Design a protein around this ligand. Structure first.
Ligand code: HEM
Ligand code: HEM
Ligand code: HEM
Ligand SMILES: [Fe+2]
Ligand SMILES: [Fe+2]
Ligand SMILES: [Fe+2]
Ligand SMILES: [Fe+2]
Ligand SMILES: [Fe+2]
Ligand SMILES: [Fe+2]
Ligand SMILES: [Fe+2]
Ligand SMILES: [Zn+2]
Ligand SMILES: [Zn+2]
Ligand SMILES: [Zn+2]
Ligand SMILES: [Zn+2]
Ligand SMILES: [Zn+2]
Ligand SMILES: [Zn+2]
Ligand SMILES: [Zn+2]
Ligand SMILES: [Zn+2]
Ligand SMILES: [Zn+2]
Ligand SMILES: [Zn+2]
Ligand SMILES: [Zn+2]
Ligand SMILES: [Zn+2]
Ligand SMILES: [Zn+2]
Ligand SMILES: [Zn+2]
Lengths: 158, 158, 158, 158, 158, 158, 158
């Protein structure tokens, strides 16, 4: 079913955000794993799978709407070298992606693509969950201090 | 444990090959799925997961060896517009990647990184399985003709 | 709870679309069944049940909003005499119904009937699934040819 | 128990036939497997195991009768390069072996080796089953055409 | 995937070794079985199945590499007439085959056929297990004497 | 089967490394256990069992190759008096042993003892896992501080 | 709890006996295993594990009593080249160790270390079980002769 061209472009831009997050979350996860921070590996890996699910939804939607998913262009990763820096980088990325989502959702409505909109609202709800987790962890670092925060990451949560 | 620098560079190059294959296999899978070619979606999606597992092994190995995994640079995807063209593109990509693997495996041996070598031989064995599947499908297209080949893809295999 | 009058009129128009689709899908299903095209019977019958579920939702919603569901007026069926013609007819009907849905969803929003809107977005998501299935089948007919396509319909899919 | 010398010679000749069939069926099976013709691999591999069971019976019988099983001499394989050619080659081989079996069974009777005869009649019954399968497949190739025949081989039968 | 020609020749030579061992182990097994030496039948039959598995791996590998498996040429069997002689003959054969394996493994490495090499190292590991079993049995014959050794073979081991 | 003499000498040297590690890991484990550091006892004890498994493989391999395993000579233990010192000592020992392994693996290849090589590559893979664990723990001590690190050891991990 | 210094020295001497027995029993076990003497491997390996358990008890006791377990010094192994010689060597070693145990048990009593004594009496009871097994086997060799004795070792006991 031929979709609106600018909806497809938005879907590809949002797909691009997901592709960056997939990689950045996955590297961050395995860095934490390497450092023995088991709990942070489990969550960040899970965040990565979440983004893969989001990318898959975009790809299938773009294809249904008869567009060409773009998996060739990869935006900038900002990896970071310590726990706080990497968590903040994930947060900045989530925030920019949520901004793009809000723009796309408004636009899909105005051209009556209510199912692309509905999909995107579900994804944004997931993103705000990701934002909440990052914000909470970053605040915990400050509240209990880094040494205590790191000790709390060495065992996986049941 | 500080690894050999050129082994790490090879691991990053091989990781780069996997990142291209992950995306190309995943798009191809969902294109087939869109077209109703259920069987080709299932296999290509599975090939994609295989490459993700390979990428994960590289990332963890690079990190152990104290290098920086590179997930920022993404080589060229060659998507293709019809079944044969997309299968051939996956094959060309596999063949180039197997070539790089052979070079890396020889080099790891000469610097005594026998566990990076061992990991890479396991991965190459998987790649040759991927090559075999692609070659077989492409030959089946020619042998039974495209119409019959397409009809054989519409139901998933048990 | 007294609903908006024009929302009720939209709900009745959309109900009318569903009543046409229920009958056209059901006849098409049993035509396919008669012809031994088991797989097409199963899917079209299922599409028919889907439309019945949609009609039921409209009826219950209209009644809640204190309107009179209209099951008396039945729009034009376009049955068709061969597989392709009947599938295209179902597609044209789905496309017109999706158009009406988009109009109604926009209008419900402007009068703040957010639950009629929410119901209608769910239904449209189902309709786009129906559209996708029809488009895919029609493309498969062209790609594998009619004889092969027909052979692929004689056994039901597990 | 000292057997008749010419019965032992017949048993060794029949053993020789089985050794050829074991190898030819096994190669043919893996050629089909390589080509993605899963169904033909399964049946030909099974035919190969059948011949191994036949060879085992001959070996044990020759030994009981106090002869020397001959596994050293291997007659001519005729492999063939395409499906029809390889199936016909298996058929020609089965037909020659059935001929030898008929001769041996007649002879065993005339020297009162009724248990060698009984074993050989069971084996011939199996061989005629193998002949029937080959003849049927070859006729199916002609009836549905090679392209359709090949498409029908790509999935294993439950 | 077109393999190296000399690797294919090595694979065919190694296949040839396996074909000899399959037959020699299988005859030896049924000779032992005839003699009531149940335990030696079970192990030698098992060794025979092992060699069949090895031959199958070679055949599939040669075919993947686009060569022609050679099951036509059968090297010399050395059957032997008593337990010690037959066990020694199996040992001499294993030793020659291990020698050929070592040569082939070195060569596959030098042309970067690391998966043929990997397969062959697995097979050699199995062969050294076969060598160990033969050497052990032969030493047991000398240590406990032949009469005691034979008595120990008449019941199968749980 | 008579092995290469220098391979046997390497196997005995590597066995010697394992015998040192068995004892040093086992004492370290029970020191941690005494101190109430349950988690460190469990892992170090497990590392000790791993080394015992490695020693067993060497012993069995040396014996197969017809050499004399040397369990008489025991190299220097470096026990250490506090957690960090003992973990570093285990690390230094692992690193020297990995060095010896790399040398032996290269040599086994050059004399075509591919199964001793294969065994040793498996063992080295295990050793690099041991190295990774030690490095990670030592870095955790510095990152969270010793007091927090010690508190994290008092309960065993599920 | 600060133990008596001479008790700790006795515990270390007894530990030293156990470390010799662990190694000698383990090598003897794998020599028997190599020779196909399955039953002797199972028992000697088990005796080895028993000594490991004894060593562990000493180590934990020494540490509790605030001494330094000595795993660095390893007394003389006497391996032996044939079954009888190796069994006698294990026996001589057990006998010397039982002698040391008797001395230590008497001394622990005189300084009121009744729990070290109690532990040591349990260990001595185990040692006398080991002595009994060795004496019995050695007498069986003489009674049934070596050839019969060896034949009786080739299958493991249920
Ligand atoms: C590029 C770096 C990536 C890495 C390292 C990676 C890694 C992984 C791993 C380890 C898994 C678990 C395998 C399993 O399902 O059992 C997984 C699952 C999955 N991946 Fe990826 N992936 C990557 C990118 C992608 C991309 C680009 C997509 C496309 C949208 C994708 C889609 C999926 C999906 C749909 C699953 C299955 C989710 C589930 O059911 O658990 N991944 N990935
Ligand atoms: C030529 C003399 C041979 C004899 C007498 C023989 C005999 C047997 C027998 C009795 C079996 C057990 C049947 C079963 O699987 O239940 C067997 C299994 C098998 N044979 Fe043969 N065989 C011979 C040669 C070969 C050859 C040349 C190949 C080709 C590589 C081969 C491949 C196999 C395989 C793959 C199995 C199944 C293994 C398993 O899963 O148990 N055999 N053979
Ligand atoms: C010298 C100091 C040693 C100590 C204190 C020690 C201690 C232990 C203990 C407590 C166990 C657990 C018992 C069980 O299996 O339930 C064990 C297991 C074992 N040990 Fe030792 N051991 C030592 C040396 C050795 C040596 C030199 C070897 C020879 C290679 C060895 C081989 C084994 C094996 C094969 C196991 C069984 C592993 C399993 O399946 O859990 N050990 N050891
Ligand atoms: Fe989630
Ligand atoms: Fe796979
Ligand atoms: Fe449905
Ligand atoms: Fe059969
Ligand atoms: Fe085996
Ligand atoms: Fe481990
Ligand atoms: Fe015991
Ligand atoms: Zn996302
Ligand atoms: Zn997110
Ligand atoms: Zn890969
Ligand atoms: Zn691949
Ligand atoms: Zn509907
Ligand atoms: Zn519909
Ligand atoms: Zn037969
Ligand atoms: Zn047959
Ligand atoms: Zn073999
Ligand atoms: Zn073998
Ligand atoms: Zn080790
Ligand atoms: Zn280690
Ligand atoms: Zn003891
Ligand atoms: Zn003892």
């Amino acid at each position: 079913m031929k979709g609106d061209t600018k909806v497809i472009n938005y879907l590809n831009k949002l797909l691009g955000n997901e592709l960056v997050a997939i990689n950045q979350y996955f590297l961050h996860a395995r860095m934490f794993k390497n450092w023995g921070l088991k709990r942070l590996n489990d969550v960040e890996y899970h965040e990565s799978i979440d983004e893969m699910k989001h990318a898959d939804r975009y790809i299938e939607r773009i294809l249904f709407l008869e567009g060409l998913p773009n998996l060739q262009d990869l935006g900038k990763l900002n990896i970071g070298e310590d726990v706080e820096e990497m968590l903040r980088s994930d947060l900045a990325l989530e925030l920019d992606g949520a901004k793009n989502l809000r723009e796309a959702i408004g636009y899909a409505d105005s051209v009556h693509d209510y199912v692309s909109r509905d999909m995107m609202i579900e994804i944004l709800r997931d993103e705000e969950g990701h934002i909440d987790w990052l914000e909470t962890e970053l605040d915990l670092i400050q509240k209990m201090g880094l040494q205590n925060y790191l000790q709390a990451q060495i065992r996986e949560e049941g």
